[PDB]
Structures are given as C-alpha cells and as structure tokens.
Amino acid sequence: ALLKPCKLGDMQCLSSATEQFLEKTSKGIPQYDIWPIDPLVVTSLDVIAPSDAGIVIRFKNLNITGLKNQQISDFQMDTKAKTVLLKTKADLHIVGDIVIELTEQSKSFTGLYTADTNVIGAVRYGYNLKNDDNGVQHFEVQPETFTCESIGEPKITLSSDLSSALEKDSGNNSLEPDMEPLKTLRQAAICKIAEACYISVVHNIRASAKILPASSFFENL
Ligand SMILES: CC[C@]1(C)O[C@@H]1CC/C(C)=C/CC/C(C)=C/C(=O)OC
C-alpha cells in the first residue's frame, strides 16, 4: 500500500494521498521503477541563454530537495475527455556543478551553483483505462505537457572563485543580475530545472499506474 484510494473530487483525500505517495517514493522504489524524488538528482542538463546563443550553461549532478513536500494547487480531471491537469507548489533547494561556456570567446568557468525558489509546476496529460493480460485494470498515462507557470524569486549563488573569474572577465567588482549569465541562471535555467523535476514527478505517477490497479487511485470511475 503506497496508495490511499480517493473518491473523485475529494481534494482533502487527494492531498493526504499525495503526502503519503511522495514520502513512500522519496528515495525511489526500484522494483516498481519509481525514481527517487527527494532528494532528486539530475545527471546532466544543458540550457542555452534564450537571449544569447553563445552562452551555454551545463549543469551536472544537481541535488534537488523539496519535492516530497509539494502541495496540490490545482487538479482538473475530466473523466470524459480522459485528461488530467495537475499544478503543484514546491519549495526547491538546488545545488550542483555548473559549467558556463562563453563559446564566442572560447572561455569557460567551472563551479558550484546554488538555487532556492518556490515554483509552480503545471502538467497536463491524457490517459486511457486498460486491462492487463491478468485482467486487472490500469491507468495508462500518456506523455505529459509541462509549463513552468511560476519560477518565484530565485536566490542564486555561485562559488567564490567562479564569481571572481566572471568579475575579472566582465570587469565589474560584483556579479550582475541584469546581465549574463545571472539572467539565465535566475530564469530559463530555473524553468528547465523545474521541468526535469516534474518529468520525474510525472514518470513516477506513470510508473506506479502500470503496477497498481486503477481502483487504488480512485474508487468509482
Ligand atoms: C494514474 C492516476 C491519475 C489518473 O493521475 C491521477 C492521479 C493524480 C494524483 C494527484 C493522485 C494522488 C496520489 C499521487 C500519485 C500524487 C502524486 O504523485 O503527486 C505528484
């Protein structure tokens, strides 16, 4: 029992089912293919700066805490058109290796990246209801669409040496938020990190719905 079954529409039951689920799955369940979500590690993620093609940010081994305590802020399940809209509020703390490539100059900056913010992640997915060969009914959750509805106000830190290197390159005594690469680090990088998190989040729902009878998610249908 990793699932508490809920009546359709009871946000109270859903909220404590969500709490249960994230705790039970926080450090992963490899026999069910459930990825660890808190702490969630992201091997590798690149982001280009939307407003500068010559800045490549490469993240390695990001350590992300705070997903096991996400709160449902919107749930819209249409049992006719067979769709789900889920939105959650998460308090994220993110730490990891960062590589900043200024390709146009053939320069590079290695270091440690830190981010704290609250995000709101929005996922939309279709599903079907379908039986096993053993004759047990399962949800099949189709590939989801993700929106980074809110990135909050991120608090970004870089390593002390990484900072001094950029201060020496740019020519300013401080790191500059109205400029590159902090602008990308505050925004798009956050939007992308949040997407990686909700990919794992939605995969775990998918993965668990392969194993568990659909009646373990909702009682009537
Ligand atoms: C396959 C099930 C279904 C149709 O997609 C609907 C279930 C969505 C939710 C919130 C169920 C409550 C328990 C879970 C797993 C919460 C969760 O993982 O939050 C991130």
Automatic annotation (TrEMBL):
Zn(2+) 1 binds at D33, H203. Gene3D superfamilies: Haemolymph juvenile hormone binding protein. It comes from the Eukaryota. The keyword Translocase does not apply. Zn(2+) 4 binds at D132, H138. This is Hemolymph juvenile hormone binding protein. Zn(2+) 2 binds at D91, H93. Disulfide bonds join C6-C13, C148-C191. Pfam families: JHBP. One of its GO terms (molecular function) is metal ion binding. It comes from Bombyx mori. The lineage of its organism: Eukaryota, Metazoa, Ecdysozoa, Arthropoda, Hexapoda.
